[PDB]
Amino acid sequence: SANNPWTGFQIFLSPYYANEVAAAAKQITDPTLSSKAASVANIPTFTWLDSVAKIPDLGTYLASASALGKSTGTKQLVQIVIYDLPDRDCAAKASNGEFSIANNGQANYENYIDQIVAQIQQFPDVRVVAVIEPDSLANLVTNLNVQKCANAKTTYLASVNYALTNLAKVGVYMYMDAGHAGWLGWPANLSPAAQLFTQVWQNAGKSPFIKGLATNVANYNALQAASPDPITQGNPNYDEIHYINALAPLLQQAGWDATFIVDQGRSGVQNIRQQWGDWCNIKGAGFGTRPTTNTGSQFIDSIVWVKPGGESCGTSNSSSPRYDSTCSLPDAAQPAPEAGTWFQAYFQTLVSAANPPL
């Protein structure tokens, strides 16, 4: 559209990912591979606010971005993921979300949003782009027979509403998570998906700050595949461009000229999955297309790196309180540490298998 949130801005680079990557590169013994790894700290990623404990970090990033913009004569942009719904990840075998619907989950989540708004309010010279709640609304399309998801439906809808409505008041550009081509891109899922996302957009007042949708977050799909991944059989929308090309007109018909961002951070290697639903620490993944607004699609504002490659998706240790058995599948890299903690061997392969090369 006319207003691409990224145009004319310099993206603030995550210091947390930068620190993880710096510590990782010096453990990589091959000196040319190590230097390639270190340059990954120069590639913009999204910062995940997956708990209230991450909110002070947001404050420091906004303040640092503000000072960097003044130091360099630029306008800075901070990239965040809103990821703390009560009863988070309702269809998963395990979730790490700190809030529960049974224990004031909605009110606690609204306080989490309020604390994020109170930080953003203080730095109006910094632009913020937020991905809204991966692995949430997409469950309300296809997973309503999971009892945890059926029970969470009204809370997901109310809490996402609260996030959209209140982040809009401080001017945050927002992309609702919308799964990926293998989830909502199935032709039969397109209309129910469009209906849900449009209703959410309406409930939040159709704010122009609700730009559209984020796809392939933390996943591995191609944006544009040379040949369909065997896991996609039965779905004519076998990559993200097919999915977005099919969904975007349905949103436009409802009055919402929605645009998209697409995670490609771990999309460099295709055809590495046994089944499309396999999502955890998929073995052999490589860093993919670097973030850019040169997307080739009228519908896509940016290719992005939302999931930071090298942070684990989940432990493969079946004795952990947080164990998700998806993370022990044959196509899952093992042994894997706890979700969010650094997974050095996985990072090294992301670097070695990067396509385009680093």
Ligand X SMILES: *[C@@H]1O[C@H](CO)[C@@H](O[C@@H]2O[C@H](CO)[C@@H](O)[C@H](O)[C@H]2NC(C)=O)[C@H](O)[C@H]1NC(C)=O
**Closest separation in Å from C-beta 95 to ligand X:** 16
Q: Which is nearer to ligand X, 317 or 352 (CB)?
A: 317
Q: Which is nearer to ligand X, 94 or 146 (CB)?
A: 94
Is 334 a binder of ligand X (CB under 6 A)? no
Is 319 a binder of ligand X (CB under 6 A)? yes
Distance between CA atoms of residues 353 and 264, nearest Å: 14
Query: Scanning the structure block, which residue is given the tokens 């779905």?
Result: 235
Q: Which is nearer to ligand X, 331 or 338 (CB)?
A: 338
**Closest separation in Å from C-beta 320 to ligand X:** 4
**Closest separation in Å from C-beta 137 to ligand X:** 31
- Indicate the SS3 state at residue 30: coil
Q: Which is nearer to ligand X, 165 or 334 (CB)?
A: 334
Distance between CA atoms of residues 76 and 166, nearest Å: 21
Give the one residue of 297, 317, 334, 352 binding ligand X; rule: CB under 6 A: 317
Q: Distances in Å between the alpha carbon of 61 and those of 7, 97, 120, 347? A: 20, 23, 10, 24
Instruction: Give the range of 24-32, 119-127, 245-253, 314-322 binding ligand X by CB under 6 A.
Output: 314-322
Task: Spell out, one character per residue from 258 to 297, where the chain touches ligand X: x when CB under 6 A holds, - when not.
Answer: ----------------------------------------
Beta bridge partners of 129: 79, 173
Give the one residue of 320, 334, 344, 352 binding ligand X; rule: CB under 6 A: 320
- Indicate the SS3 state at residue 77: strand
Distance between CA atoms of residues 251 and 200, nearest Å: 12
Instruction: Give the range of 66-74, 245-253, 261-269, 317-325 binding ligand X by CB under 6 A.
Output: 317-325
Distance between CA atoms of residues 153 and 166, nearest Å: 20
**Closest separation in Å from C-beta 337 to ligand X:** 7
Q: Distances in Å between the alpha carbon of 27 and those of 22, 34, 37, 49? A: 9, 8, 10, 27
Instruction: Give the range of 70-78, 258-266, 316-324, 344-352 binding ligand X by CB under 6 A.
Output: 316-324
Nearest by Cα to 99 from 91, 146, 90? 90
Binding residues vs ligand X (CB under 6 A): 317, 319-321
